[PDB]
Amino acid sequence: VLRSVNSREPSQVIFCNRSPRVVLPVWLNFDGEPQPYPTLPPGTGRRIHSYRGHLWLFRDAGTHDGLLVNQTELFVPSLNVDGQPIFANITLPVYTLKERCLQVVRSLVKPENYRRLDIVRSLYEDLEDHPNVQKDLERLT
Amino acid sequence: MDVFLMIRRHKTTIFTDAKESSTVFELKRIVEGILKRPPDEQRLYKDDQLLDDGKTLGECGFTSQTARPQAPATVGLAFRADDTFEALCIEPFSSPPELPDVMK
Amino acid sequence: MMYVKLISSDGHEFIVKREHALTSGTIKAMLSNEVNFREIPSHVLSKVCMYFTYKVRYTNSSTEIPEFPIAPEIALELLMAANFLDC
Ligand SMILES: CC(=O)N[C@@H](C)C(=S)N1C[C@H](O)C[C@H]1C(=O)NCc1ccc(-c2scnc2C)cc1
Question: InterPro entries given for it (chain B)?
Answer without folding.
Answer: ELOB, Ubiquitin-like_dom, Ubiquitin-like_domsf
